[PDB]
């Protein structure tokens, strides 16, 4: 009768699907609540400067 391409016939899936995605790379920046200079400046008087 004739030849047929593979795509010509509908296919049912005999595979079970399992989807895994990787963990994304992340970057941690330097973050502080108070720096050294701010903590030093918190004092009302500094003996050295005075």
């Amino acid at each position: 009768s004739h030849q047929l391409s593979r795509a010509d016939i509908t296919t049912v899936s005999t595979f079970i699907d399992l989807n895994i995605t990787m963990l994304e790379d992340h970057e941690f920046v330097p973050l502080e609540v108070y720096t050294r200079h701010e903590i030093k400046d918190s004092g009302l008087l500094d003996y050295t400067e005075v």
């Binding site: 009302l44 008087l45 005075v50």
Partner: protein
């Protein structure tokens, strides 16, 4: 400085007055009822008094 003129064998007194004006940075902390100057001298009055 002004010092007394020399007279042999005497105790002499001499007075000098130097009028000084300065710009200083004054700092206050909560509850802002006192503030201190850059020279280490406290002022016992709120900066916002008026």
């Amino acid at each position: 400085k002004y010092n007394p003129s020399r007279v042999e064998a005497f105790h002499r007194y001499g007075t000098t007055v130097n009028c000084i004006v300065e710009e200083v940075d004054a700092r206050s902390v909560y509850p802002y009822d006192e503030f201190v100057l850059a020279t280490g001298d406290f002022v016992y009055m709120s900066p916002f008094y008026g």
